[model samples]
Target: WNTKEEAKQAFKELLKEKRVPSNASWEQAMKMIINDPRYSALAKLSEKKQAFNAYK
Candidate 1:
């Protein structure tokens, strides 16, 4: 898988693992996974924001 795809995949896994708050926004969720590379994968706020929206 490509980098972004890997990042995207892993991001989902983090969501599965970390389990984001049901009502949290992307900014809030980002902090939850801030220590993980999956967050960095979607470094740009908009990018990860999109990631979270799709996952949401």
Candidate 2:
């Protein structure tokens, strides 16, 4: 759960680093995040996705 929080930390940081369009898709976002070191923040697959869903 705490690791999820870490993922959350990078969630916004990555957002700040890489802005997403309203039309942004995870397929694209996954790539967007792939470009950032913050991508490592995604420890769990669910938390990783939830991070974006929340941001969405």
Candidate 3:
């Protein structure tokens, strides 16, 4: 995912290759990405940064 556009293409490709149904909805595709362990590390880092900012 280079930018939001490529990010979407990645989702569609994942759906096609993984046999996951494509709903033609960006939000739905993003939900799958957000829920996957593949993003766990990045999710944790981003969350930590957000929390740090909240404390400022």
What C-alpha lDDT values do all the predictions have? 0.64, 0.66, 0.44
**Best-first order by lDDT:** 2, 1, 3
lDDT of 1 by residue, 1-56 (tens): 33445556767677666788778876666677886766655675455555444555
lDDT of 3 at 10: 48
Candidate 2 local lDDT, 1-56, one digit each (tens)? 36555666676667668995658875776778788775665744565776555555
For candidate 3, write residues 1-56 as lDDT tens digits. Answer: 22444434444555454455544454454455566655443344434223323212
Top candidate, metric lDDT: 2
Best by TM-score: 2
Once fitted onto the true fold, the runs of candidate 2 whose alpha carbons sit more than 4 angstroms away are 1-6, 43-47, 50-56
Candidates 2 and 3, the one with greater lDDT:
2
Query: How does model 1 fare in lDDT?
Result: 0.64
Give the lowest summed-lDDT range of ten residues in model 2. 38-47
Name the lDDT value of residue 33 in candidate 1: 83
What is residue 10's positional error in candidate 2, in angstroms?
2.4
Q: Candidate 1, which segments miss by more than 4 Å at Cα? A: 35-56
